[PDB]
Amino acid sequence: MCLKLNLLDHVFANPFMNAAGVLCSTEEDLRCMTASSSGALVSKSCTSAPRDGNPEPRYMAFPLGSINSMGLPNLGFDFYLKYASDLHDYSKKPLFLSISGLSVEENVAMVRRLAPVAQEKGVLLELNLSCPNVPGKPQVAYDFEAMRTYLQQVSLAYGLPFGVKMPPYFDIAHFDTAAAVLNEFPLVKFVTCVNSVGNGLVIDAESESVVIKPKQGFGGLGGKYILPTALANVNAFYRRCPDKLVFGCGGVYSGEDAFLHILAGASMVQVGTALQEEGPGIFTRLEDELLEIMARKGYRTLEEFRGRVKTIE
Amino acid sequence: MCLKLNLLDHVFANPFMNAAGVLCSTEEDLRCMTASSSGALVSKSCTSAPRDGNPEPRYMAFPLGSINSMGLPNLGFDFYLKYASDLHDYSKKPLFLSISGLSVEENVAMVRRLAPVAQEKGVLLELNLSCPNVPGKPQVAYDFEAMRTYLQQVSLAYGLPFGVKMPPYFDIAHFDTAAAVLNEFPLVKFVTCVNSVGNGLVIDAESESVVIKPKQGFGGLGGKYILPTALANVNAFYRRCPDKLVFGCGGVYSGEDAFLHILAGASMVQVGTALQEEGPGIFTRLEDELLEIMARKGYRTLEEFRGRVKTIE
């Protein structure tokens, strides 16, 4: 019994990977994720130029999850591209590269350069549709016309199958509109649901203070807080995008959590907060625990139950 | 050292009250809330006509919170207006009446008839804007033009101070726009943040099934899941609406949780899920717990620390 699967013309030993931004910023990080038992890895969302990010403290974790306002610190696109083209050992597992330019033109410039490497080496693109706040306009994935422009421009520039990292939605009309946008683009072959739940606020009762420095303490939430939100977004897009894969992210700490994401529709399962907190050991645990639940249920494959969450009649 | 507040021309023994929908649908429920140690109570959001609501199961609770798609079951406006006009004992505590018409005209019809009772008896209106409008459009408060129309029409029809119940927002642009809309309406004297986090999905691993019947298992989340989201919305509206009160709702299980809401800016503090699960005894516990945190810190009144959350550097 093994968890190997095939997606996007690649073979995966198991459905687990890191979530973008966690354990994936530096060469050291990417080597550590490669050496882990994860089925794949994704690089830190990048910009054309390197970024320092926001002042520290910018990430904190707690028993129920995490809050962050990192500010997109990254080593820049040239580094990640080099890692993809020269350094990654593809014999060990697939690599996804996350891009998050601050305008459409920046995304286009990056993807034009990634394309040949994607062709030659098989690196996969995850386009992050979330960015630092600009006063006066919403995040791109929350502005449907902007989203359509980004996907039109990236599709043209890139020309090859890619995926999109989505923020959570909370309204059924929004799910319908967003999915319809995504389904206009045949090159969008996977959708990753979800990014952090935006602009939460954690306060420490003893100090009477917020816990992160940027944005007056406001930052995205991950971990246990967000599992039902994540499951709902996975399932909503799984139902609406039958010609795409859905990758689940949010609130995975256990094989059971992964099992729920898969039941909701997830093909790959990404781990953020829990990986940040436990380290890359977590992947062997998650695999063991998912296999144990499959065995207790009599499931031999992921396909037997992916998307098969039951509704009440 | 005391929990007393004086706001909206009423006196409150303490800041605690039920959240709309919990322990407030029937005369029995309102009598129970009145007999409790809470500082106030709110009646179940109503429509002009009585509603049975959605099929059961439609609420479920778990260690980290709750999910619901109740479908607005209620006894109809005339019953809650009779309770306000004829049955409530205002010498025990203040009463809020929540309305949640399914169109602007239904809201207008109710408020026109509420107004004389509000003027004579002092019942306070909470208008629910985290509510459906046209199916396939977002809920009212996620549609800023609709929201503006509702507030214009209700301000004209009612002509007295009222408050609004808001869904959570997740994007700074939304906080900015929503607050700006609210600030167009001088009669909006309080803003209650937040309603449930919309369209989550809880799945039970053993049965491989969603846990509520309506909407294929999708429903609004309350409880421990949503505290940091609640705190963020309280503080965001507190900062942006300096001429209004903010009432906090979401994730209150303890005096400490309430202290965080108040630090964020809350005047009143509403209790949903935890009240549903524990019952009205919770209010003595929350009062004792909040008084003990105040004693330890040397605070004598709520105003000493309301809105006084600290930011970093």
Ligand SMILES: Cc1cc2nc3c(=O)[nH]c(=O)nc-3n(C[C@H](O)[C@H](O)[C@H](O)COP(=O)(O)O)c2cc1C
């Ligand atoms: C420290 C930190 C940095 C992150 N950076 C990014 C990023 O660069 N790109 C991205 O798509 N998401 C990023 N995220 C979001 C995560 O990929 C993931 O969507 C989110 O944390 C929810 O998953 P979780 O509940 O497992 O943490 C970041 C998350 C954290 C905690």
Ligand SMILES: Cc1cc2nc3c(=O)[nH]c(=O)nc-3n(C[C@H](O)[C@H](O)[C@H](O)COP(=O)(O)O)c2cc1C
């Ligand atoms: C069973 C149930 C019914 C509710 N009905 C309403 C309602 O009629 N009107 C409304 O404004 N909010 C309603 N809500 C939302 C709550 O008032 C509250 O905003 C939400 O549950 C978050 O608070 P909590 O974390 O304390 O549960 C309901 C919540 C629950 C759990």
Ligand SMILES: O=C(O)c1[nH]c(=O)[nH]c(=O)c1CCc1cccc(Cl)c1
């Ligand atoms: O680097 C980040 O702060 C980050 N954190 C996340 O949880 N998700 C992300 O996608 C990112 C990068 C993009 C981004 C999104 C929103 C705010 C900021 Cl400061 C940065």
Ligand SMILES: O=C(O)c1[nH]c(=O)[nH]c(=O)c1CCc1cccc(Cl)c1
């Ligand atoms: O009665 C409800 O489902 C409900 N539940 C909540 O958590 N908050 C609410 O504001 C309400 C009432 C509004 C509402 C929400 C969803 C469907 C319908 Cl028909 C009406």
